[PDB]
Design a binder for this molecule. Sequence first.
Ligand SMILES: CCCCCCCCCCCCCCCCCC(=O)OC[C@H](COP(=O)([O-])OCC(O)COP(=O)([O-])OC[C@@H](COC(=O)CCCCCCCCCCCCCCCCC)OC(=O)CCCCCCCCCCCCCCCCC)OC(=O)CCCCCCCCCCCCCCCCC
Ligand SMILES: CCCCCCCCCCCCO[C@@H]1O[C@H](CO)[C@@H](O[C@H]2O[C@H](CO)[C@@H](O)[C@H](O)[C@H]2O)[C@H](O)[C@H]1O
Ligand SMILES: CCCCCCCCCCCCO[C@@H]1O[C@H](CO)[C@@H](O[C@H]2O[C@H](CO)[C@@H](O)[C@H](O)[C@H]2O)[C@H](O)[C@H]1O
Ligand SMILES: CCCCCCCCCCCCO[C@@H]1O[C@H](CO)[C@@H](O[C@H]2O[C@H](CO)[C@@H](O)[C@H](O)[C@H]2O)[C@H](O)[C@H]1O
Ligand SMILES: CCCCCCCCCCCCO[C@@H]1O[C@H](CO)[C@@H](O[C@H]2O[C@H](CO)[C@@H](O)[C@H](O)[C@H]2O)[C@H](O)[C@H]1O
Ligand SMILES: CCCCCCCCCCCCO[C@@H]1O[C@H](CO)[C@@H](O[C@H]2O[C@H](CO)[C@@H](O)[C@H](O)[C@H]2O)[C@H](O)[C@H]1O
Ligand SMILES: CCCCCCCCCCCCO[C@@H]1O[C@H](CO)[C@@H](O[C@H]2O[C@H](CO)[C@@H](O)[C@H](O)[C@H]2O)[C@H](O)[C@H]1O
Ligand SMILES: Nc1nc2c(ncn2[C@@H]2O[C@H](COP(=O)(O)OP(=O)(O)OP(=O)(O)O)[C@@H](O)[C@H]2O)c(=O)[nH]1
Ligand SMILES: N=C(N)NC(=N)NCCc1ccc(I)c(Cl)c1
Ligand SMILES: [Mg+2]
Lengths: 63, 98, 55, 38, 459, 347, 320
Amino acid sequence: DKRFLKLLRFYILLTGIPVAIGITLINVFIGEAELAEIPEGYVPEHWEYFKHPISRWIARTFF
Amino acid sequence: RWQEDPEPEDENLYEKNPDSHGYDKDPAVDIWNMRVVFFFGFSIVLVLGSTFVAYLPDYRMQEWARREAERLVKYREAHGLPIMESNCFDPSKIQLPE
Amino acid sequence: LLDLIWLEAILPKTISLAQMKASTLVTNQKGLIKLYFLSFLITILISMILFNFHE
Amino acid sequence: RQWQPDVEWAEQYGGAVMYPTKETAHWKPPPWNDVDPP
Amino acid sequence: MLKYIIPTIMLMPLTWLSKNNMIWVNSTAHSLLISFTSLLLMNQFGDNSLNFSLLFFSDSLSTPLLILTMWLLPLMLMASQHHLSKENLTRKKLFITMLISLQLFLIMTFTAMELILFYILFEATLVPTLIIITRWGNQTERLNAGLYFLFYTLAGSLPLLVALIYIQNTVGSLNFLMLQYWVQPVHNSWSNVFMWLACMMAFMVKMPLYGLHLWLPKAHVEAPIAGSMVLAAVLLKLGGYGMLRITLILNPMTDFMAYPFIMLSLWGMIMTSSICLRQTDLKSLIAYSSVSHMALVIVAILIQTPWSYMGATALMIAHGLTSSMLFCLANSNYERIHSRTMILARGLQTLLPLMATWWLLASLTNLALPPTINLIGELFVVMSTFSWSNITIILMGVNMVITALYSLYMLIMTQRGKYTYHINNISPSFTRENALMSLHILPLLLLTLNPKIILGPLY
Amino acid sequence: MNPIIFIIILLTIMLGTIIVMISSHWLLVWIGFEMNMLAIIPIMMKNHNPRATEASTKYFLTQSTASMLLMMAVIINLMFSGQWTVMKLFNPMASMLMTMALAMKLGMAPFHFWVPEVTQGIPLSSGLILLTWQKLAPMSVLYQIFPSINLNLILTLSVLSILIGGWGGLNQTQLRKIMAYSSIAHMGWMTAVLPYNPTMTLLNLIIYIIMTSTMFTMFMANSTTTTLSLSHTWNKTPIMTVLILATLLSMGGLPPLSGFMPKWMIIQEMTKNNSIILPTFMAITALLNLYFYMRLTYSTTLTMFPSTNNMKMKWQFPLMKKMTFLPTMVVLSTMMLPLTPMLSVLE
Amino acid sequence: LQYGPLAYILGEKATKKMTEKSKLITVDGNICSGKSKLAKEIAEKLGLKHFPEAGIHYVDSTTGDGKPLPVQFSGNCSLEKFYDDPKSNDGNSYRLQAWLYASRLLQYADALEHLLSTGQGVVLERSIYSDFVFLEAMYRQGFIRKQCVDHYNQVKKVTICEYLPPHVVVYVDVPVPEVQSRIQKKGNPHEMKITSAYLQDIENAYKGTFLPEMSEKCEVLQYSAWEAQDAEKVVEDIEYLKYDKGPWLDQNDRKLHKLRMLVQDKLEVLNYTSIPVFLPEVTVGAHQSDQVFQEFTELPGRKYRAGYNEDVGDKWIWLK
Ligand SMILES: CCCCCCCCCCCCCCCCCC(=O)OC[C@H](COP(=O)([O-])OCC(O)COP(=O)([O-])OC[C@@H](COC(=O)CCCCCCCCCCCCCCCCC)OC(=O)CCCCCCCCCCCCCCCCC)OC(=O)CCCCCCCCCCCCCCCCC
Ligand SMILES: CCCCCCCCCCCCO[C@@H]1O[C@H](CO)[C@@H](O[C@H]2O[C@H](CO)[C@@H](O)[C@H](O)[C@H]2O)[C@H](O)[C@H]1O
Ligand SMILES: CCCCCCCCCCCCO[C@@H]1O[C@H](CO)[C@@H](O[C@H]2O[C@H](CO)[C@@H](O)[C@H](O)[C@H]2O)[C@H](O)[C@H]1O
Ligand SMILES: CCCCCCCCCCCCO[C@@H]1O[C@H](CO)[C@@H](O[C@H]2O[C@H](CO)[C@@H](O)[C@H](O)[C@H]2O)[C@H](O)[C@H]1O
Ligand SMILES: CCCCCCCCCCCCO[C@@H]1O[C@H](CO)[C@@H](O[C@H]2O[C@H](CO)[C@@H](O)[C@H](O)[C@H]2O)[C@H](O)[C@H]1O
Ligand SMILES: CCCCCCCCCCCCO[C@@H]1O[C@H](CO)[C@@H](O[C@H]2O[C@H](CO)[C@@H](O)[C@H](O)[C@H]2O)[C@H](O)[C@H]1O
Ligand SMILES: CCCCCCCCCCCCO[C@@H]1O[C@H](CO)[C@@H](O[C@H]2O[C@H](CO)[C@@H](O)[C@H](O)[C@H]2O)[C@H](O)[C@H]1O
Ligand SMILES: Nc1nc2c(ncn2[C@@H]2O[C@H](COP(=O)(O)OP(=O)(O)OP(=O)(O)O)[C@@H](O)[C@H]2O)c(=O)[nH]1
Ligand SMILES: N=C(N)NC(=N)NCCc1ccc(I)c(Cl)c1
Ligand SMILES: [Mg+2]
């Protein structure tokens, strides 16, 4: 039982720590988008309608 | 009434491999099976999958609708209009029977 | 009373008994040429006298 | 271990018919090679 | 959907061309990869569904059912590889192929745009499921469980085929997107009454509706562990998914045609919850518990309200993870003592402490402890049925009490008390078993953080 | 039989059928049936045992009686129309006689009694011809005269055959009797749709022939004629048990296998005609067929029956029977459903 | 081509290769009757092909690489254990006898196939026609049950009817007291446990049933232990035979073609030796039969059809 919990903890942290750090670095150094009016005669890409950089990247890459 | 093999003995994986993970009798295969389940099950699907779900781009327009409702409420109150009307459709485009 | 009995009885159990009985009726035959062709005569007679398949 | 049919289970399907009745009581399986003795 | 159908098909050659000792490692690894990619289906829009082609589409109802479907396959493989260890290689590969083909039919069933295509795949699931139960079940009664499972389903499904074909002739199309715009009201008449019954009875047997449920406890007690997991987690939800779609074209006749089935469900849930209090077979107790849980789903689908449809979707997903986990928990005991009698092995918490924790969490979800999605879905249905008729809160409330009683009776009977003296082969829990339990409960409890993704199209 | 004589007799069985299918004159249709019956008797008698003689005699009496009724219908038709053209008949009594005659030839209930007996009494290879090729000639005549057929008569025959075939097979352990009752049930489906869409009669006939030929060939491969003899296949050729299982499920009409295609298309055509009760009853009654198909799968593929010690000797020798076209037939028997729209080539 | 209707049509008829030396000869007699020695002398002198008596492992000698297989693939039938414990609870006595009839049936088909394909005669030591003398002896001594005898007669009824009897049957008559004396000199410890009642039963069945039956349809030559030493007189006796009885006179190329199609396909030969008659002696459970069949396929050159086994050196498999 002890070995399983240690293995479970290790593999969650194997990616959980890098993700937690990646999220923090994205939040601090890239930041969120700023809401703005659509400039006259401008056609935003479908992923420019979202605020958080990770959400924008998900929309641009997969959706 | 026949020639039949007796029922086999029940095997315990720990007797021959005390470090067995319960996946396979072969210790090398047993460890690799443990790793793929844990890496792909927990490190990938659960951790990245939860991250992916948390950052979905405005799932089902819920945030857009709130921003849109704020705009409509501001506009309709600045011009004395009702916040909401009982009719969904303009009655001038409806021809009642009779 | 309900789950191991009556719900079992009022459908799956009774249905299977019906088919098993009908199967014995259909297949319990004597293999006699005389009887089979005699039933052909009855069939042809019914088709005309009772059902008017000839019209 | 997993149950598999035994002789008693198999004998259900070796009779002349699947559903015994009084009428077919005397029926017997046909010859293995279809040839009835003269 | 080809990005899921084709890799699912490729799992077959991967299994057959794998080294002898790597069939379980390879199929598990790559079925987990497919499950990962299924999250891309979560691109759901507020107004329109995600319509891939003339054949397949995905909306907020099918998306969670697809993600649950593709998640279960790797879990089923982990759950099956121990009792299949003595099987010869070709038959192991055949067993895995049946599981892969089931996933292939299921993902296609949930995304089929046309109802007759849905019907064919909805029936195709019978074949692999029947083969798994009758070929790899353990006891003599698996042959009869296969027949009851097969003929109950076909008894209702053949009328559905006639009704669907009739609808296509009358309306011109069975494309679900077209039916949304071309649907016409159903006027009272004896013809429409039987059209209603033909459209719904097949799905009622799958749920199963109380009265048509006797096949389910048979199937579970005889099925192998993977057979029970898919049966309980996903196959029962075909009926609910079909009802949620077909009810579109049955209004307003469903207003009064629902009554006999609501009474069966409302009373049935109490009867089957009470039956669980006296079951002697652990697998039979859990199977009866599913009938009680799906009675709620039938009522929610039939009363046809936005809250009830959201509760049904949450309940279908929550029950799938919970019920599957309970079967895996019961199976881990079975692999030690080789019996399903609940009273045989007691006080197991003293011998398997961590496994007793999984039993606790599975029980707590089964009785719908807030804020688990089990409670969210059940609460939404209770909220909606109270508006349907205030008196229903008495039946819903009573069922809550009995559900807690039998969930904890199961926990107290097997985990607490004194261990059976003569049982001395309770070996410590394997990593495989502990991982299997955690891959059920962890996604279940995580979903509490973001319930909206399992609340369906009415959200 | 001398091999060249066997070939010449088979070519005459085929020629008799072909004459029926290409004839425009009722006399030549009658000749086609006479020639076909002349050549089929020797292949039933080829094993010279009392059971074969009884089967040939029972077969001869049934088919000779049917051909006499057919000639009677032809002559009545000549009297009331003064012509021999193969087409709709010009007198209702002629139509009843011709329809009844062809029902006797097809072995449809209540003229079915001979089919299980004759099939049981002749070798498997002879039974394969009797239950497949022999259906072609009567079906091709029904295809041409259906506009004049009495709707009540033909649908009554179809309903009886579906019921009798389904109930009769439940009590059978002999594989040749099972196939015979399965044939009667399937003939019912073919003729139920004939009044509405003849093309669906052809589709059901073609798929039925393919599946029946697959079953008979698979029985011949191992020389099995009883349920228990077939239950030993798992201990000799495991692959065959899987092919038997798939073919039987297809014959049961389960999706997504090929045998679901004709029942699906026949239900469609009838519903387009506002025939709802009849297709529903037929589909439910066909569950009887699925039951004794599934019983065979249980004792063949899904469980392992007891074996004998002498089976070990058979392990050392390969299957030397021809099994002509079997790999192709089994694939068509099971995997054709995605190609269903191809049925229009029969239009 | 492989023999078949086409080869038959293209001129390959049995009567073209057959002569007056195309004969089937079987040597019978009790145990330790010198029948094996005489069988080799008739064969070599007459120019025929000698078949040693079919034993437990005969089928192995004709398939694979010809070496005997582990006993488990013969069902653990043992002739030694039959002498030690003829009344063993395992049912070894009848299981052995049922196995031996099948082996003889296969050998008889082999011998007939050799005769029809080449026209050369063959010499056999006992055959399916005389196999029952051992079954009768076992029953009379209480070694097998009456149900076993019924199974044996069922299998024999639907198998023997297909074949033709020997042209010549040769019987070497040796009284039981001398057989019991010769067994001692041969000095096999297991065979030394045989009793005279068993031997007398074999003698009775031979004289009471076999020879009277074989005379009505074959040529029977009976010799004493002394007379059988002079093989040349025996070979002289055979050559002056008339052959005016038995079915062989009624055969033609058409009937012999049908016979050759049967005997060349061994699975068709052994079809009824495994009729589904659930006798405890010969019935094998599913678990045991599955396990043993799996081991068989793992033996060298036994997984695939002959010629498709890379593990024993077969080549060009991707073009075969
Ligand atoms: C990573 C970054 C990137 C993201 C990727 C993420 C990917 C997912 C990974 C995350 C999951 C990782 C988990 C594995 C880590 C390794 C674990 C380990 O090593 O130790 C093993 C661990 C302890 O080690 P051990 O003692 O040596 O084990 C031996 C025994 O088996 C031990 O047995 P035991 O008997 O001693 O204990 C068993 C059980 C027995 O106890 C019970 O079950 C009683 C249940 C009581 C019900 C209480 C009602 C629910 C209250 C919470 C509801 C939420 C709303 C509340 C209001 C607002 C809250 C803010 O106890 C518990 O489970 C603890 C209960 C904790 C929940 C109760 C509330 C906690 C306080 C409130 C939380 C506040 C939120 C956080 C703060 C917010 C700011 C961030 O034992 C286990 O195996 C348990 C594993 C299962 C953990 C469940 C976690 C689920 C996730 C949370 C979802 C929350 C949703 C709400 C659900 C409410 C529950 C019904
Ligand atoms: C926790 C681990 C998760 C792993 C998956 C996510 C990996 C990628 C995370 C963030 C990637 C960078 O995210 C991206 O940043 C830039 C801003 O710098 C944005 O890009 C936008 O701003 C830049 C300015 O920098 C301009 O060129 C322009 O206006 C536009 O392209 C994108 O809209 C956003 O999607
Ligand atoms: C909604 C309508 C659905 C229609 C579906 C129709 C499917 C019918 C399938 C055929 C059923 C026949 O199945 C047959 O039934 C009978 C009665 O139960 C069973 O009979 C069994 O139980 C009865 C009572 O103990 C005994 O008399 C009998 O000796 C025993 O074999 C047979 O074992 C079974 O082979
Ligand atoms: C004319 C068109 C025909 C198209 C055919 C295209 C594919 C042709 C493939 C030919 C090569 C197959 O190779 C053959 O199969 C398997 C799978 O590799 C090999 O051996 C296999 O053994 C086991 C399982 O069987 C595993 O370790 C692994 O799957 C493989 O090593 C065989 O030893 C080889 O003889
Ligand atoms: C839960 C996590 C899911 C993990 C899924 C694992 C499988 C990953 C599949 C990768 C798919 C990438 O697909 C590829 O990406 C590029 C961007 O780089 C995209 O290329 C283009 O697509 C979008 C629209 O589709 C365009 O508006 C945009 O200009 C561009 O990004 C395409 O979508 C595709 O060409
Ligand atoms: C409500 C819509 C769906 C209804 C479907 C109902 C049709 C029947 C489905 C099950 C068919 C199983 O087919 C047959 O059924 C009967 C009972 O029913 C079983 O019969 C079983 O119980 C009977 C007595 O109760 C015993 O005598 C028998 O030994 C036992 O097998 C057979 O073992 C099974 O072969
Ligand atoms: C678990 C099983 C559940 C079973 C549920 C059973 C539901 C019963 C529904 C009863 C209503 C049936 O549908 C009802 O039938 C009657 C005929 O009798 C129809 O009556 C129609 O034809 C009659 C002819 O006499 C006219 O007089 C009447 O004006 C007209 O409405 C109604 O149009 C329809 O409202
Ligand atoms: N139970 C049984 N034993 C048999 C059978 N055929 C041979 N045997 C045994 O095989 C052994 C040798 O058989 P024999 O050929 O007759 O004796 P031999 O040693 O070869 O001496 P010769 O007669 O001169 O050839 C004897 O112990 C027989 O009992 C048989 O059909 N059944
Ligand atoms: N005789 C019938 N009952 N039906 C029928 N064949 N109708 C004719 C309609 C039709 C359908 C498909 C095609 I392709 C074509 Cl050319 C014609
Ligand atoms: Mg010797």
